[PDB]
Design a protein around this motif. Structure first.
Motif, short mmCIF file in Angstrom:
data_model
loop_
_atom_site.label_atom_id
_atom_site.label_comp_id
_atom_site.label_asym_id
_atom_site.label_seq_id
_atom_site.Cartn_x
_atom_site.Cartn_y
_atom_site.Cartn_z
N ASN A 140 93.68 47.11 10.11
CA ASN A 140 93.98 48.02 8.96
C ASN A 140 93.33 49.39 9.08
O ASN A 140 93.93 50.36 8.65
N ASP A 141 92.14 49.48 9.66
CA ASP A 141 91.39 50.75 9.78
C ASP A 141 91.75 51.63 11.00
O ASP A 141 91.02 52.59 11.25
N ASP A 142 92.81 51.32 11.78
CA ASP A 142 93.04 52.02 13.02
C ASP A 142 94.55 52.03 13.34
O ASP A 142 95.40 51.52 12.58
N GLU A 143 94.90 52.66 14.44
CA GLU A 143 96.28 52.71 14.94
C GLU A 143 96.58 51.47 15.78
O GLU A 143 95.68 50.77 16.17
N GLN A 144 97.82 51.32 16.19
CA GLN A 144 98.20 50.26 17.09
C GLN A 144 97.90 50.62 18.53
O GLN A 144 98.34 51.66 19.02
N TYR A 145 97.15 49.78 19.22
CA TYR A 145 96.83 49.96 20.64
C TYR A 145 97.29 48.85 21.57
O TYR A 145 97.44 47.70 21.12
N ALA A 146 97.52 49.19 22.83
CA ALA A 146 97.81 48.24 23.87
C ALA A 146 96.72 48.27 24.93
O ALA A 146 96.39 49.33 25.51
N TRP A 147 96.13 47.11 25.16
CA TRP A 147 95.17 46.85 26.22
C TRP A 147 95.87 46.07 27.30
O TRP A 147 96.73 45.20 27.02
#
Ligand SMILES: CCNC(=O)CN(C(=O)c1ccc(O)cc1O)c1ccc(OC)cc1
Length: 208
Positions: A140-147
């Protein structure tokens, strides 16, 4: 667009051990991933008890298992708490350095690889069956990321511009060529029933 990072030495050594050790009971990877999804689900549930708006990013708490034989991928998706970029980078929210130490000491006092989740690093068991692992996460506190990582000492992080997920974590297992059994409906069902039968959230096995 893409940042590349070195694994800390201890994590790299964990992943080499996982990849190179002869160990036939590979099926436990799925139990360990479902367990992480369950822990993330517990977390968002606990937060939502005092702040219901934490669920505005999606009310339903569940785990989906998605096999794809054309892509040779098994995907595990949850609607848990997800991870911030910082947690992604810091070993997918694990205490990986200290946990690796404790796991490898346990391995010298009789433990076996199936016990990896007792040391907080069960995520890395993905490498029993996957040549490459991709993790898409949204907290909820951040953007969507891909690792992403095919092991070999490094991983990447990027902002994900794929499908928005709302909230939670998706683990895409690009399976090794000899591990396609984990895309068969009856095998997945067997493993869920053997190791994940009392998980507290619905687990939906998608069909193809
Ligand atoms: C610990 C609080 N933070 C989360 O709950 C985030 N959490 C995930 O988002 C997550 C990570 C890996 C995974 O395969 C599935 C997931 O839902 C996570 C869950 C377990 C874990 O160590 C046991 C580390 C991170």
């Amino acid at each position: 667009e893409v940042e590349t990072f070195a694994f800390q030495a201890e994590i790299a050594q964990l992943m080499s051990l996982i990849i190179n050790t002869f160990y036939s009971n590979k099926e436990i990877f799925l139990r360990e991933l479902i367990s992480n999804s369950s822990d993330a689900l517990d977390k968002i549930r606990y937060e939502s008890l005092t702040d219901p708006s934490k669920l505005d990013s999606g009310k339903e708490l569940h785990i989906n298992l998605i096999p794809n034989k054309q892509d040779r991928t098994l995907t595990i998706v949850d609607t848990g708490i997800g991870m911030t970029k910082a947690d992604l980078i810091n070993n997918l929210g694990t205490i990986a350095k200290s946990g690796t130490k404790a796991f490898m000491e346990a391995l010298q006092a009789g433990a076996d690889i199936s016990m990896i989740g007792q040391f907080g690093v069960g995520f890395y068991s993905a490498y029993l069956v996957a040549e490459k692992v991709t993790v898409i996460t949204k907290h909820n506190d951040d953007e969507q990321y891909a690792w992403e990582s095919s092991a070999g000492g490094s991983f990447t992080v990027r902002t994900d511009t794929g499908e928005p997920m709302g909230r939670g974590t998706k683990v895409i297992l690009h399976l090794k060529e000899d591990q396609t059994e984990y895309l068969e409906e009856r095998r997945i069902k067997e493993i869920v029933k053997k190791h994940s039968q009392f998980i507290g959230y619905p687990i939906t096995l998608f069909v193809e």
